[PDB]
Structure 1
């Protein structure tokens, strides 16, 4: 089925954001498990896999709309060097991708592409859940301290 060109452009932009998130989250997850923080590494790995599933869904939607997925464009990775830094980098990545999803949802509503809007709404809910988790982790770091928090992530 032929889709709207601007809808395909929005889907490609979201796909590029998801591609950035996949690499950033996987590298963060692997650097967490390297330091012995199995809990944080496992959670970041699960979030990365969720990002891969989001990218797969976007690729399927673009292909159904007779568009061309853009896997080539990989943007800047926001990689941190310590646990707090990587948590803030992940939160900033999540926040920076939120306006794009909202704009895509609004445009899909405006031109009557309701299935794409439903898919983007599911993606937006997932991104909001990740944002909530990251903010909760940072607040916990503030409440209990860095050492206690890092101890809680040991196992």
Structure 2
């Protein structure tokens, strides 16, 4: 079904954000596991898988609309070097991702692509859940202290 060219461009932009997030979260997961923070490692692994599932749905939608999914142009990964910075890097990425999701939804609404809008709304709900998790973890570091926060994430 021929889709709106600019909708397809938005979908490819959201896809690109998901492709960044997949790799950033996967690497953060394996860094945390390497450091013995296996509860963080496991949670971040599931965050990466969730992004993989969003990217799948976006690829499938682009193809149905007769566009070409762009899996080639990988943007900048935000890789932290300590737990607090890794969480902040994930949060910064998610905040960019939700800004792009909102702009894409606006355009879907204007050209009446209501199914594309609904997919993007579902993705946006998942990313706002991720923002909640991230903001909460950063708050917990402040409340319980870094050493306790890390201690509580050693064991899965």
Shorter-chain TM-score above 0.5: yes
Shift of 1:97: 1.2
Shift of 1:96: 1.2
Could you say which residue in structure 1 is the equivalent of 2:149?
Answer: 149
Could you say which residue in structure 1 is the equivalent of 2:17?
Answer: 17
Specify every segment of 5 or more residues in structure 2 that has no aligned partner in the other structure, as ranges: none
CA distance in 1, matches of 2:71, 2:154: 35
Matched, 1:127 2:127: yes
CA distance in 1, matches of 2:16, 2:147: 36
Specify every segment of 5 or more residues in structure 1 that has no aligned partner in the other structure, as ranges: none
Find runs of 4+ consecutive structure 1 residues off by over 6 angstroms: none
Secondary structure of 1:90's counterpart equals helix
Could you say which residue in structure 1 is the equivalent of 2:107?
Answer: 107
CA distance in 2, matches of 1:14, 1:87: 21
Deviations 1:64-107 (A, max 9, x none): 00000000010011000100010111100111111110010111
Task: Provide TM-score, normalisation by structure 1.
Answer: 0.99
Could you say which residue in structure 2 is the equivalent of 1:50?
Answer: 50
How many residue pairs match? The answer is 155
Task: Provide TM-score, normalisation by structure 2.
Answer: 0.99
CA distance in 1, matches of 2:119, 2:85: 31
Matched, 1:63 2:74: no
CA RMSD of aligned residues (A): 0.4
